Amino acid sequence: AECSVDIQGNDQMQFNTNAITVDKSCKQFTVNLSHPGNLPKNVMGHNWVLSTAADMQGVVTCGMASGLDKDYLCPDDSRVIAHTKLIGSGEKDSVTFDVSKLKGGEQYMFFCTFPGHSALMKGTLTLK
Ligand SMILES: [Cu+2]
């Protein structure tokens, strides 16, 4: 089983994957996020945030006004299944979550909540 994925967010507003597969035999799944660019996090910060497709817009909106010092996420927001911190150029963060948190018939999305990023920085996550 492959129970981790490495993801990059760059200075051109791109994640390097659009779709993440979580092998259902994994008890835990890990995302290792890094930022290959030169731009600092107040200009081009990225996080990796997971929610159901239905919840994505609310999480993104709640985040846009939570501000930079809250990593553009509403604190202790239970719609967020898992998230990293907001990182800038040359930084990295990882998150590990319980695969039991994923419902098998549900649609999940991952995205960055830095204001405006999620138009491009989004993809699917699928338990299979
Ligand atoms: Cu971003």
Swiss-Prot record:
Keywords from the UniProt entry: Copper, Disulfide bond, Electron transport, Metal-binding, Periplasm, Signal, Transport
GO MF annotations in UniProt: copper ion binding; electron transfer activity; identical protein binding; transition metal ion binding; zinc ion binding
Primary site of residence: periplasm
GO terms under cellular component: periplasmic space; plasma membrane
A Pfam family: Copper-bind
Keyword Disulfide bond: yes
Family matches, as Gene3D superfamilies: Cupredoxins - blue copper proteins
Tree of life domain: Bacteria
UniProt subcellular location: Periplasm
Keyword Transmembrane helix assigned: no
Domain Plastocyanin-like stretches: 1-128
InterPro entries in the record: Azurin (IPR014068), BlueCu_1 (IPR000923), BlueCu_1_BS (IPR028871), Cu-binding_ET (IPR050845), Cupredoxin (IPR008972)
Binding site for Cu cation: H46, C112, H117, M121
Xref: PANTHER family: AURACYANIN-B, OUTER MEMBRANE PROTEIN H.8
Protein name: Azurin
Natural source organism: Pseudomonas aeruginosa (strain ATCC 15692 / DSM 22644 / CIP 104116 / JCM 14847 / LMG 12228 / 1C / PRS 101 / PAO1)
Upper taxonomic lineage: Bacteria, Pseudomonadati, Pseudomonadota, Gammaproteobacteria, Pseudomonadales
Gene that specifies this protein: azu
